[PDB]
């Protein structure tokens, strides 16, 4: 009790809100996931206690490592014949030994050939990055490590330090995980066996203020069961309605992720008010029974069932008073047996129906009537990508043939929308289907979390193929788009949320950003419960790196509090008597202490040291964000950065910067594995909160405006910034990396790029910042060449009318055409994104720019003439 008081308030600290604040929540659902989540918990810990001294160090240093060991043909080119030269320093004073080696050794191999060099200047060792706390725990070949692959792309000397293993296990403290005080604790019918159609009682609503009618609706996901029922018109003085709504479902035939949704509307030209959803069947598989009252929400169409489900926190708010039938018995969902025999007593007599049996219905088909021509039709189908109309007729017909689906698993996505989710006797053999369903890729498994996928069945199967094919790099790669599709879930205590948790508790890194995602949304109510409890579970669990996270928060705390007296007391003040409030604010004892001494929140492997104070500024963008600078305390910080420098911004939301560099990211991948090098520059970007975030510092890069504070003076500034032999590989980079820039920003339809939003770095890597808004936000072209950018890519000239011009477009075109091969992905990776609350990512019809940017219904040719004639009619000629 003692020690857990002590917790409870670091915990409390780290998540923005006291612990007892959830211990008085009365709703059993939130008291039993917080008792048993601590099975994840306990899995985790014991995963770092077992091999207990190397499995430690792994949870807290793992391994930064890509995905595949295989290198491209083009980065294997880069290489002396296979092999790398690598530095491998010794602090004895500091000594470099250099090493030439195989690209694919072993960290011990590479330790063993610096013992040997040692030597000749005449398993206790492991390998650590200079300049960051990153290592090399782990027997992976030395080029599959994300530093190395770095080195080699990018032409840089690896350097690497030798550490003995008790030094840095010396340092990792144990930590024991204690479990919390909380962890110590009519007849029952079947659904099926209820013969009666859904009513639904309305009785009236409360705190309906104003200078009306409830509509109503049964909803599979976004998919209607059933038609919507309204209620009759009321004034809102009096909103007291008092009818049992009845709606076109059979009470058996409701699915597992029914939702009940609704809405206070007024009246033509009728308008929402308030709206909120309902779970049909509770956490324990129990339908809903008696009376319930519904906190409603504010809108942001009549319904809502995109729309989060559970009662708004806020009671103060309109408050819809709901009865639900009652039957005498607490009625509950079938169990998987009930369900398996149903589903095998229907397949059965579906392969004993006759031809004309079979011909009464488009959705029943016999078993020996498939042809080649409608099997090559289903693969036609699961080659579309997930906002392609699937017809009513292509429902019947993939539905009929489901068995033969099983062979093509991607269709899986497909055949589900084909189902009747208000028939059980069909979602029944689904759940049969689902749970024999062969693995998908978990690229594919991602579209089965998002908001189209409601079932549990469905949504399990999706996280079994991450458990088994997502690898810890693509996990954080995608850890944003995972946190976000946990909104979607109907409750609480899922698998989902089980397997999130258990990798932020078995991987550190992973741990960070999991914490931050969550951290970053703790102000919503509609996510505050689940992300908070969720939060309290990680922090209970996740041991020493608690304390180090809330080093971070109370930073960022203050950072948020200093900048929010600047834009409220000091609004009008000018730069000086601004920065000298700054510098003696931040040098008050409990502030610097708090504001130095911490690990970077954009990367937890940086350790910021003392601040430079000297080197801070506030800046002149828009929101005057603070430009700070940290020392790096590693002892070779010289051979990485000796500052590390973030852009600190409040006022602006940067969740669009965020996906929109992730996106890049990704899109680079695509490009260098397909062997096109067209290196892009997706910096850092972090949203810790409301409008607020970080933004990593790319060094020696300027703004075109920069640049030019004629059209040939940034090609003549990186001719003095690149003399000599250097040259042609400046305006090849530049040339490769505008080309990347070009595709990615049409495809994305990212802001209008100006002088100001577009830099270069001094070696002629050209990148883009501050990105804004994305899609429909016909199609635009942000980013216009204008004859400054054509100058410097056809080397000083008619810059149009060159051979250095038709390399750069067939860049661009092999470059657009890539992206189009994977955009699945990036459709699904922006569906997985709509439970976030940005306002240029409401709907499908948002995402479905990208459809259009793709030219998806179009051809491979005609998807080049398309993006051909946008750049053509941009530029007003050259394309
Ligand atoms: C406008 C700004 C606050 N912003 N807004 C949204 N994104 C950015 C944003 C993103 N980056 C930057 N700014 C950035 C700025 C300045 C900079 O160097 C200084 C010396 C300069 N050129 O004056 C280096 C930089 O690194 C690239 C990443």
Not at 149 to 164: D, E, F, Q, T, V
Not at 335 to 349: F, K, L
Not at 679 to 706: F, W
Request: charged fraction near 25%.
């Amino acid at each position: 009790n003692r020690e857990e008081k002590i917790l409870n308030r670091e915990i409390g600290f780290a998540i923005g809100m006291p612990v007892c604040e959830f211990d008085m929540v009365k709703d059993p659902e939130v008291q039993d996931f917080r008792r048993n989540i601590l099975n994840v918990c306990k899995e985790a810990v014991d995963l770092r206690d077992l091999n207990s001294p190397h499995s430690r160090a792994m949870y807290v240093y793992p391994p930064n490592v890509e995905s595949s060991p295989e290198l491209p043909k083009h980065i294997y080119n880069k290489l002396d014949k296979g092999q790398i030269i690598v530095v491998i320093w010794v602090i004895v004073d500091k000594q470099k030994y250099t090493l030439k080696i195989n690209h694919d050794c072993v960290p011990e191999q590479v330790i063993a050939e610096a013992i040997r060099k040692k030597t000749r200047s005449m398993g206790k060792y492991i390998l650590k990055v200079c300049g960051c706390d990153e290592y090399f725990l782990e027997k992976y070949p030395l080029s599959q490590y994300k530093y190395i692959r770095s080195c080699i792309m990018l032409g840089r000397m690896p350097n690497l330090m030798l550490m003995a293993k008790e030094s840095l296990y010396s340092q990792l403290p144990m930590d024991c995980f204690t479990m919390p005080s909380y962890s110590r604790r009519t007849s029952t019918k079947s659904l099926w066996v209820i013969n009666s159609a859904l009513r639904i009682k309305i009785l009236c609503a409360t705190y309906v203020n104003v200078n009306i009618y409830v509509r109503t609706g049964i909803y599979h996901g976004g998919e209607p069961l059933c038609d919507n029922v309204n209620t009759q018109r009321v004034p809102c003085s009096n909103p007291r309605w008092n009818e049992w709504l009845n709606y076109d479902i059979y009470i058996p035939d409701l699915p597992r992720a029914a939702r009940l949704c609704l809405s206070i509307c007024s009246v033509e030209e009728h308008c929402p008010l308030a709206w909120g959803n309902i779970n049909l069947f509770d956490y324990t598989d129990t339908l809903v029974s008696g009376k319930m009252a519904l906190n409603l929400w504010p809108v942001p169409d009549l319904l809502n069932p995109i729309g989060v489900t559970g009662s708004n926190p806020n009671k103060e708010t309109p408050c819809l008073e709901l009865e639900f039938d009652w039957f005498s018995s607490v009625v509950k969902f079938p169990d998987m047996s009930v369900i398996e025999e149903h589903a095998n007593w229907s397949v059965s007599r579906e392969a004993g129906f006759s031809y004309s049996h079979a011909g009464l219905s488009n959705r029943l088909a016999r078993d020996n009537e498939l042809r080649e021509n409608d099997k090559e039709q289903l693969k036609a189908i699961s080659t579309r990508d997930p906002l392609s109309e699937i017809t009513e007729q292509e429902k019947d017909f993939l539905w009929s043939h489901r068995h033969y689906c099983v062979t093509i698993p991607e269709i899986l996505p497909k055949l589900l929308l084909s189902v009747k989710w208000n028939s059980r006797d069909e979602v029944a053999q689904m759940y049969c289907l689902v749970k024999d369903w062969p693995p998908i890729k978990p690229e594919q498994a991602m579209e089965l979390l998002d908001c189209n996928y409601p079932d549990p069945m469905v949504r399990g199967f999706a996280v079994r193929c991450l458990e088994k094919y997502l690898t810890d790099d693509k996990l954080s790669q995608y850890l944003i788009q995972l946190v976000q599709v946990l909104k979607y879930e109907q409750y609480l205590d899922n698998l989902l949320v089980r397997f999130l948790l258990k990798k932020a508790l078995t991987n550190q890194r992973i741990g960070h950003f999991f914490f931050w995602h969550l951290k970053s949304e703790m102000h919503n109510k509609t996510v505050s419960q689940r992300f908070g409890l969720l939060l309290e579970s990680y922090c209970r669990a996740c041991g020493m790196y608690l304390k180090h996270l809330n080093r971070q928060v109370e930073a960022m705390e203050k950072l948020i509090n200093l900048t929010d007296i600047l834009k409220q007391e000091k609004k009008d003040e000018t730069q000086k008597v601004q920065m000298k409030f700054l510098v003696e604010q931040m040098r008050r004892p409990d502030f610097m202490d708090a504001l130095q001494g911490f690990l970077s929140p954009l990367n937890p492997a940086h350790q910021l040291g003392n601040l430079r104070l000297e080197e801070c500024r506030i800046m002149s963008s828009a929101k005057r964000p603070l430009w700070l600078n940290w020392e790096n305390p590693d002892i070779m910080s010289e051979l990485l950065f000796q500052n590390n420098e973030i852009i600190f911004k409040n006022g602006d939301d940067l969740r669009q910067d965020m996906l929109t560099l992730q996106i890049i990211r990704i899109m680079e991948n695509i490009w260098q594995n397909q062997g096109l090098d067209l290196r892009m520059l997706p910096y850092g970007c972090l949203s810790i909160g409301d409008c607020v975030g970080l933004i990593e510092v790319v060094r020696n890069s300027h703004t075109i405006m920069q640049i030019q504070c004629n059209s040939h003076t940034l090609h003549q500034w990186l001719k003095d910034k690149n003399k000599g032999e250097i040259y042609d590989a400046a305006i090849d980079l530049f040339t490769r990396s505008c080309a990347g820039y070009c595709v990615a920003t049409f495809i994305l339809g990212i802001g209008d790029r100006h002088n100001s939003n577009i830099m270069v770095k001094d070696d002629g890597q050209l990148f883009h910042i501050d990105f804004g808004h994305f899609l429909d936000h016909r199609e635009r072209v942000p980013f216009v060449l204008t004859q400054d950018f054509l100058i410097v890519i056809s080397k000083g000239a008619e810059c149009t009318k060159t051979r250095e011009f038709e390399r750069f477009q067939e860049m661009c075109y092999k470059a657009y055409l890539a992206i189009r091969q994977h955009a699945n992905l990036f459709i699904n990776l922006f569906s997985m994104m709509l439970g976030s609350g940005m306002p240029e990512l409401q709907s499908f019809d948002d995402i479905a720019y990208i459809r259009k940017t793709l030219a998806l219904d179009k051809t491979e040719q005609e998807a080049l003439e398309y993006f051909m004639k946008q750049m053509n009619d941009a530029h007003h000629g050259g394309w």
